[PDB]
Design a protein around this ligand. Structure first.
Ligand SMILES: [Mg+2]
Ligand SMILES: [Mg+2]
Ligand SMILES: [Mg+2]
Ligand SMILES: [Mg+2]
Ligand SMILES: [Mg+2]
Ligand SMILES: [Mg+2]
Lengths: 251, 251, 251, 251
């Protein structure tokens, strides 16, 4: 127990699915957690479902909102003390080829998936450096950050950007002895109530030519690698990509 | 000779350095070439320096300008007939860590380096598919698309995006039998009049801990791999990364 | 606590340094452990230093010895019951360029580093498949499995082989529902009594152009990622490379 | 024409398929070529089919034969003058999972695919360094050097080894100003009389879930990238992987 003793984590998109499992396991391991989401109705209920206000709170925020990031860090420090841990998990998807991607779809997906991760990473380094917190920025960077998908053009762009921008941040933090690590987590297909809402999606994702294990993962599969990366167990890991994909990228 | 017989190429940022060497070798191999740049004074002189208007022309264009891409394809087809070949070479750099990157710098660099490559790739697929041209989109994607640099945060983001968005486009074009290939070229440090304007830059780039060959490359090093990728010699290459870096990424 | 409840692990080269830290953390998390080494004098003392014979024992074995692998699996099952977990950690190094590598050095290093990992992986799949153990093969595959070192030619060959042979094994195990996962761990430079015996080694490894964190790791850094991979926490991870290198490969 | 003016190349397994296409294009571009194979009957006819003895000769050799490499370099220098160019192309395949691989199959495949490439690379550096030849070692390293195949365990081991051992050699040659470059070529599935002898193979390889272009390549696809890498056009490329796979590894 207590693998995140004393840690203070922000988890973007922490009210559902992968983000909620990360928040749940973070609280179970002794972190204080601020989860973000778009909808107070979902977010407040999610926080209460996991624990008490001394353990977990909700902050309504769109990760694309630059000024809101300031308010989010300030609210988390007011609630829990200085932030040690940021999981940039909030993301959206557009099911279009590059050929069929409208510029509106392109800009909207990059605002969340790329600007959001940039804004959170930049502010995280500024607020967490040089405080002896054992600080950790975990960027959600997808198997779509390693391989293309013909129907996820803008998503591929965003996840490749997060993958290599995270290495830049990791290096600067390491060279300057900031006590901040930056790593990416690369989920394969994960069962979420959302996947459950797309008829035939889980079966298509489970075909051996997609996921060799012949089934998709579960939110806890991503939560456990995030616990490792938030913990001081991973104090020599920075600038690295952690893939949990049932073998998708191995073939 | 004649390795690009009958090809019609657009080269963005083709008036200087790497882009001009690509344009020069493309014309030498029998392609018709439209080069783009920001400044008619530089661009018109560059085109005339390489060949006659039947071989090479200039089109003034900022790669971030979405509507200008339409005019650029229309001008190239009017001059030379249908476009077969696009080199997305235009790029800018910001020498900032992620921590120190202003949002203005972030948006300006992504407008050229990421939106520009998206706009050119999307329009290229639409205009070049299903015409039996042996069409080839060559995206400039940098060693900074493989490894971080602590002082090139936004540049790293842009080059990782180009790397994996190019794989998406390659796959969609391959699966749909579009007769369009999409590949990335990843230069290491290359001597340009620009590098020459930064005192100490070439020496720093030439240190064995950076470039193991102990010197930097020249624009022709990038021109020759682009000739291969534009030619029908590379008709089975798509979705691949071609690195020419004096060993930078091998260590 | 108890993250390896009920697991039965073999750790090759488990009597010193990285392997001993993996054995120590495995026992702390409730695994039964058989450690191997060449020297009974070191191995027996190492096992007793960690725990009781019901928790940890020593088996004298050179990982290059094909027939000894049979005896090692049989001894582990006799002591602890069916084997769930194999860490192929035993390795040797030759400090020669490819140019200067003698064929004797080549064959000796590949016998331990490649044949040993093959023999253990092959026998592990045969003995651990289809038993509902949540079986996990963790192959030690080095940052030298990603990048070259001019003075580690044969070592580079061995670690690249382990990296991609492990993906083959992972895929076959996944496609056949064997309940066996196969992953590689890629340490950067780690402080061991051995590194301590090479004057100037740790300082050279700690230079920012080598390890950006400006120091090398410790055996526990490798132990903690191995606990994750042995545990059921990583039940969706197979065919993946886990890098813990202080940023070595990120630049 | 004349892209390999004055080059003297050894191509192992140059009597059939990929190696013969590389030899053919090398001669067409002005190289003198020694091709190797196991069978004088095939090899002598192959050499005569391509050109005159001043252009191309055959040398009977198993790439696993260490002493024969000495005789091969000596014969090539006697025929053509000092060797500038080595293509380590000779290889064999075993269609077994790691689980099902016999130790005999393992040792036989590694003798050709790994020892052969080591022996040729080591001797190539020794004989070609510091002679101003613009020397180039091209190691055949397969898409099976990037991704696993559940039924090519030993082949995966060999191709991952070649991939990263080649980076070691490239770095040492670059750091020591040897005038020797070392790069790997990674074919996807290529139509050879051999593939033609395996009923259903080409169709299985052509499925969109394997090769997105929906067909396999031809030997000339590998010949053209080898011409680039042998030529002085690629004088800044070392330690790099060149993939020609119809999109296999992009998904
Ligand atoms: Mg409480
Ligand atoms: Mg003319
Ligand atoms: Mg590096
Ligand atoms: Mg006890
Ligand atoms: Mg003649
Ligand atoms: Mg794949």
């Amino acid at each position: 127990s207590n693998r995140l003793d004393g840690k203070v984590a922000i988890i973007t998109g922490g009210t559902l699915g992968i983000g909620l499992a990360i928040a749940t396991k973070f609280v179970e391991e002794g972190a204080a957690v601020m989860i973000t989401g778009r909808h107070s109705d979902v977010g407040e209920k999610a926080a209460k479902s996991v624990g008490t206000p001394d353990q977990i709170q909700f902050f309504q925020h769109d990760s694309s909102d630059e000024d809101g990031w300031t308010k989010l860090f300030d609210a988390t420090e007011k609630a829990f003390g200085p932030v040690s841990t940021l999981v940039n998990n909030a993301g959206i998807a557009v099911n279009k080829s590059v050929e069929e991607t409208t510029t509106a779809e392109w800009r909207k997906l990059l605002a969340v998936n790329l600007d959001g991760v940039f804004f959170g990473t930049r502010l995280g380094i500024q607020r967490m450096k040089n405080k002896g917190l054992g600080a950790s920025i975990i960027n959600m960077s997808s198997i779509e950050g390693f391989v293309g998908d013909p129907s996820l053009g803008a998503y591929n762009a965003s996840k490749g950007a997060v993958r290599i921008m995270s290495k830049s941040a990791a290096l600067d933090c390491a060279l300057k002895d900031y006590d901040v690590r930056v790593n990416t987590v690369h989920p394969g297909y994960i069962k979420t109530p959302l996947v459950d809402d797309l008829p035939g999606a889980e079966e298509a994702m489970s075909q051996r030519t997609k996921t060799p294990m012949g089934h998709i993962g579960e939110p806890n599969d991503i939560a456990y690698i995030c616990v490792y990366l938030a913990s001081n167990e991973s104090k020599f890991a920075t600038g690295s990509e952690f893939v949990v994909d049932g073998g998708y990228t191995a073939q």
